[PDB]
């Protein structure tokens, strides 16, 4: 109030306290305040309700704030009755029309209930259904986690809580949380071992562990029946053995397993049969899935219908592909809107589905180009080449499971083979077979890329099996053969990383069997560099040095040859310590850096800087660095600049001044603040030491660098110095 100052004052001043314009002002204000005293709660309530009608966000917020408060003012008997009635309310079918609302009214209702104190108990299976159905995913997950922690993580209630939580974790693609829960839950040690293996990409070991668990379970079934408490573990074994077989590229066995009599799995066959060109089984599985399919899988059913429409030997129907692609996209978008608004691992399947669906459309375009009317026409050839190049550049990423890589590459393989068949059977146009050779090259490149991705993910045996399919092709261009041999060599190097001599011998055998005469000079240089690597691991130092020398003489720009020769010489230098080996290693490393790809060269310049620690009193290694560093772009040295300044303060800074000066010339702001800081630190230390003083040699070098930068970049350095001068007021 205006007069509230009186109430705040002490008793003495109040006791002491006890014109026309001012009187008129206070009268008019009293009449105003009397008009306000009339204002009633009902008016605000009505206008509030109207604003809740206009605004859905306001309505949702108000209900979430209001229902717990109403619940608190209920009695205990009323609360128990209302909870017992709320449980079937959430389950009701009428809510299903809300499913695609954003928000669903049932979503807001469940969010309001979760805030209630005392809590309203909800069955775990209901919570899971609501989480997956009404976009309540993480709310349901957190509620189930709280229920599990309250119950001490077994009794059937604890069983159903952990079941619903595990299913929600699996549906959210939260692999680690699911793994932790099941490691605590599982009854068989083999299950925990298998989960640990699969969690980190050891799919072969995980598959063996799942098989061992199944063998133990069968051995125990001959003694007694199995309780329903262990059935989720057996379901886990079956599902993740299937997943491991998918990651291990075992699609034929999975198609056979899915067609087993009495235990048919049409969904597995529908996922697997098309990859091995079993289109009859694909049609049968499509019919069974179409009668009875989960709603989330609808887009995949449309996409597989497109697969059959394109690739089935007899039922080719290219006119359906546009509508099938549109339907798949619409269904995928609908599924996307049912996912959480923050994008996480749960969204990855649909983000992969996007590329899959557009590649289905592009495949339809390619097959339209191969029809007898269009075959050989210039526009068809141009479109085919364009789509092949677009596929070549458009790849998945390394975090993607090998099953998704398999999907993309095997679909493309079917269309590459279609191109090859079309332009080999006709052979009227293209008498030089360039179109068939384009198909063959694309297929070989796709096979090599699949094998390379398998090797990068640690599935070296899978990669070796994949790469062996190049020999199936009758003729392949020499580039693809070179890449295949290179990937095989890398596979054997990776295997020797844990096995040792034998895999190095196998890689050397592969290199020796290679018929160089077809290969170019760069290919020969890469082969000899690989041979040098293998011989270095075999501890055949002399032959490895021969191989590296010959490799670099073959193609003196091959960065990898220089880097591997430098690694070999640095390993010999660290032990034997003759300085000439240090100089050779620095020369090799610096010649590997003579390019702008700074991310590759970073690990080599680190070796160069580390090697300067072995320098003698004559600065031989620093002399080599000064000689060879010409041709290394200064962008290479940006990450190293702290280390370069540390060397600058040392005795080797006399020979490294030109390098740092060049870096400062090209990147003045990068050098200026570190050199300035170093110079002032040196001055402070000098003042402490002689507590004017002649500047030391490192100070002179810093001053030279700063003077050169002031000469080349005077407005920039005056702006930087102006900024730093201002910082004192801070």
């Amino acid at each position: 109030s205006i007069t509230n100052v009186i109430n705040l004052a002490d008793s003495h001043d109040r006791a002491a306290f006890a014109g026309n314009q001012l009187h008129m002002l206070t009268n008019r204000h009293d009449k105003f305040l009397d008009t306000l005293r009339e204002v009633k709660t009902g008016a605000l309530l009505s206008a509030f309700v109207q604003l809740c009608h206009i605004s859905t966000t306001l309505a949702e917020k108000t209900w979430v704030q209001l229902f717990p408060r109403l619940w608190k003012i209920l009695s205990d008997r009323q609360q128990h009755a209302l909870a017992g009635e709320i449980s079937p309310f959430l389950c009701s079918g009428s809510h299903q029309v809300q499913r695609d609302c954003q928000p669903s009214a049932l979503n807001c209702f469940v969010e309001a209930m979760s805030q209630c104190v005392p809590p309203i108990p909800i069955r775990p299976c209901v919570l899971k259904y609501l989480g997956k159905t009404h976009n309540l995913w993480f709310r349901s997950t957190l509620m189930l986690e709280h229920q599990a922690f309250e119950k001490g993580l077994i009794t059937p209630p604890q069983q159903e809580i952990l079941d619903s939580l595990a299913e929600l974790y699996s549906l959210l693609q939260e692999e680690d949380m699911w793994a932790g829960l099941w490691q605590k839950r599982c009854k068989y040690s083999e299950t925990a071992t298998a989960i640990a293996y699969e969690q980190h990409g050891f799919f072969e070991q995980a598959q063996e562990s799942y098989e061992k668990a199944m063998d133990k379970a069968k051995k125990e079934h001959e003694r007694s029946n199995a309780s329903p408490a262990i059935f989720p573990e057996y379901q886990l074994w079956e599902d993740h053995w299937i997943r491991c077989s998918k990651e291990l590229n075992q699609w034929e066995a999975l198609t056979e397993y899915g067609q087993s009599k009495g235990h048919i799995n049409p969904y597995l066959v529908l996922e697997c049969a098309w990859r091995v060109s079993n289109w009859t089984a694909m049609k049968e599985a499509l019919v069974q899935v179409e009668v009875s399919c989960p709603k989330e899988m609808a887009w995949k059913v449309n996409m597989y219908r497109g697969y059959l429409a394109i690739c089935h030997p007899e039922e080719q129907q290219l006119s359906f592909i546009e509508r099938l692609v549109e339907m798949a996209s619409s269904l995928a978008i609908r599924e996307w809107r049912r996912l959480p608004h923050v994008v996480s691992h749960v969204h990855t399947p649909l983000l992969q589905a996007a590329q899959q669906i557009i590649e289905l459309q592009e495949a339809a375009q390619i097959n339209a180009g191969l029809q007898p009317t269009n075959l050989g026409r210039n526009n068809s050839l141009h479109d085919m080449k364009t789509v092949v190049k677009t596929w070549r550049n458009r790849l998945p990423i390394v975090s993607d499971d090998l099953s998704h890589w398999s999907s993309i590459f095997m679909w493309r393989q079917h269309h590459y083979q279609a191109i090859v068949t079309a332009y080999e059977n006709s052979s009227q146009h293209d008498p030089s077979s360039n179109n068939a050779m384009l198909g063959v090259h694309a297929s070989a490149s796709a096979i090599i890329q699949y094998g390379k991705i398998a090797r990068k993910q640690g599935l070296v045996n899978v990669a070796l099996d994949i790469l062996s399919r190049i020999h199936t092709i009758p003729t392949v261009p020499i580039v693809d053969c070179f890449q295949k041999i290179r990937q095989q060599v890398k596979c054997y190097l990776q295997l020797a990383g844990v096995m040792g001599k034998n895999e190095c011998m196998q890689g050397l055998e592969v290199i020796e069997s290679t018929n160089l005469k077809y290969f170019t000079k760069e290919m020969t240089a890469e082969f000899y560099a690989l041979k040098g690597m293998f011989l270095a691991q075999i501890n055949k130092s002399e032959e490895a040095n021969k191989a590296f020398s010959a490799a670099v003489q073959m193609h003196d720009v091959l960065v990898k040859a220089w880097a591997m020769w430098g690694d070999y010489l640095e390993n010999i230098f660290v032990k034997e310590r003759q300085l000439h080996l240090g100089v050779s290693a620095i020369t090799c490393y610096l010649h590997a850096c003579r390019h702008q790809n700074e991310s590759k060269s970073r690990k080599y310049l680190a070796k160069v800087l580390w090697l300067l620690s072995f320098d003698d009193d004559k600065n031989t290694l620093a002399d080599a660095v000064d000689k060879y560093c010409i041709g290394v772009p200064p962008i290479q040295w940006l990450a190293w600049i702290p280390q370069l300044l540390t060397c600058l303060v040392g005795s080797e800074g006399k020979l490294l001044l030109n390098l740092i000066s060049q870096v400062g010339r090209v990147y003045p702001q990068a050098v200026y603040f570190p050199i300035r800081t170093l110079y002032l630190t040196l001055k402070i230390e000098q003042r402490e030491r002689y507590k004017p003083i002649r500047a030391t040699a490192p100070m002179w070098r810093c001053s030279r660098i700063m003077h050169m930068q002031r000469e080349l970049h005077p407005t920039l350095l005056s702006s930087l110095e102006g900024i730093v001068d201002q910082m004192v007021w801070f």
């Binding site: 986690e145 922690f149 993580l153 680690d176 949380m177 699911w178 793994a179 932790g180 829960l181 490691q183 605590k184 925990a192 071992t193 298998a194 640990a196 293996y197 969690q199 980190h200 050891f202 070991q205 562990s209 990383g497 970073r602 690990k603 680190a606 070796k607 800087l609 580390w610 620690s613 072995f614 320098d615 190293w640 702290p642 280390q643 540390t646 303060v649 040392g650 005795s651 030391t696 040699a697 490192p698």
Partner: protein
């Protein structure tokens, strides 16, 4: 903190970004023993996995994503192609030069033999911890034991009270 023998993570050092959940440390330093120039970091706990953090992560969060992420990082940095040992050598060389300037001392450079030996000893200690954590034979990892040691109240109660082994 454990593999690179960094100083202890005080709760004042641990910066939590409310808008994203990203964590940064202000500021880690190498735990060089000033008297001998080698790394120690032999503390009762290998890292901060203190009871308030443990409760917030939950036991599922500790077992699953925390452990799996530590194992994955250890296995990644142990890949020979990355050559992490060389980067460690070139960073610890500056660290050892700084320690020599602080403790032992154109000013003369420190002895090449001493510098090389100290850097090699420190990088060997780092790579030993790295390769211990990276080993994953039998589906079992040392990282589980490391996490159990960090959470263990026996190890927590032996820490500095200023570390806040209750927070």
């Amino acid at each position: 903190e454990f593999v690179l023998h960094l100083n202890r993570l005080n709760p004042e050092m641990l910066q939590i970004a409310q808008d994203t959940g990203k964590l940064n440390v202000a500021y880690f330093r190498f735990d060089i023993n000033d008297a001998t120039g080698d790394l120690d970091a032999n503390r009762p706990v290998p890292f901060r996995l203190t009871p308030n953090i443990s409760e917030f992560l939950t036991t599922i969060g500790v077992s699953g994503p925390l452990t799996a992420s530590m194992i994955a990082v250890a296995r990644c940095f142990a890949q020979p192609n990355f050559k992490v040992d060389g980067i460690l050598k070139t960073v610890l060389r500056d660290e050892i030069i700084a320690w020599h300037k602080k403790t032992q001392e154109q000013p003369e450079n420190m002895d090449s033999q001493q510098l090389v030996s100290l850097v090699q000893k420190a990088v060997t200690a780092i790579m030993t911890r790295l390769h211990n954590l990276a080993q994953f034979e039998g589906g079992e990892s040392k990282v589980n034991t490391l996490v159990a040691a960090a959470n263990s109240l026996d190890n927590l109660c032996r820490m500095d009270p200023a570390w806040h082994p209750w927070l």
